[PDB]
Design a protein around this ligand. Structure first.
Ligand SMILES: C[C@@H]1CN(c2ncc(Cl)c(Nc3ccc4c(c3)n(CCC(C)(C)O)c(=O)n4C)n2)C[C@H](C)O1
Ligand SMILES: C[C@@H]1CN(c2ncc(Cl)c(Nc3ccc4c(c3)n(CCC(C)(C)O)c(=O)n4C)n2)C[C@H](C)O1
Lengths: 130, 130
């Protein structure tokens, strides 16, 4: 459960993942969600803080004095809703459901959202086939 | 950076800790903090979702229909502010600054906040001296 960290502190091995699991539980129950992300027809409820923690685009939007209080955010209508859904699930779980059928949409969405590690991972999996 | 999870998904090893680090960065800059916790004289700004993820007491408070929207929460005046500070830092970092001088205050605060793993850890470190 815990160990002696490199610093003075006792560090809890699974704490960050346990927190993320609880944040995903709140999302699943729509508890304290404070924004709706609109992608084409689709709507996705989330917590701004989680979106900011995972995405350079959301970090930029919600640190903007005018946009920080917005309850609705519309994404570029060219964004694939399934690609966005896969990335939102990844934000809340650390698991990326990458498949041959969705990798291009996921990569394009991750580029737009400025999710660097996901973009790089997509690029590596694409290179593996070529 | 990533591995093949037990499920179909690609899993990112450090994602949950990277998210928690970013949430702590937002806390340090007072960005999107939505509650102030008052302990005696002291005030602590935080994100309700993080508090709920880490504490049975905060989970109960912010899932209550009446209390969920409160911007200010007063804790029991008998709570030690340093003990609360150590636990709030732990929530956002996974690191618990447990010392001989603060262990009793930290344990009492963790019991009040319903932070089970911290309570159990305090109990184990206390037992080690006796
Ligand atoms: C001083 C400030 C600190 N910082 C930061 N702080 C807080 C957040 Cl929410 C945050 N989130 C954020 C910002 C940019 C991101 C970002 C999050 N992620 C996700 C990073 C991760 C490791 C979680 O995958 C990215 O890929 N990019 C490009 N970032 C990086 C910024 C540039 O500068
Ligand atoms: C169905 C629902 C799911 N659940 C839950 N969901 C969301 C959150 Cl924010 C949340 N957070 C929460 C609640 C209680 C906690 C709690 C968080 N922590 C922290 C747990 C942790 C592993 C992060 O240290 C505790 O020690 N206790 C007792 N809990 C447990 C509750 C009892 O039942």
């Amino acid at each position: 459960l815990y160990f002696q960290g490199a610093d003075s502190c006792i560090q809890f091995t699974r704490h960050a993942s346990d927190v993320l699991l609880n944040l995903n539980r709140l999302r699943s129950r729509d508890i304290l969600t404070d924004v709706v992300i609109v992608v084409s027809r689709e709507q996705f409820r989330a917590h701004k803080t989680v979106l900011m923690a995972c995405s350079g685009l959301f970090y930029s939007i919600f640190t903007d004095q005018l946009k920080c209080n917005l309850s609705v955010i519309n994404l570029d209508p060219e964004i694939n809703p399934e690609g966005f859904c896969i990335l939102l699930d990844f934000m809340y779980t650390s698991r990326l459901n990458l498949r041959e059928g969705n990798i291009m949409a996921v990569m394009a969405t991750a580029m737009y959202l400025q999710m660097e590690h996901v973009v790089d991972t997509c690029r590596k999996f694409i290179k593996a086939s070529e």
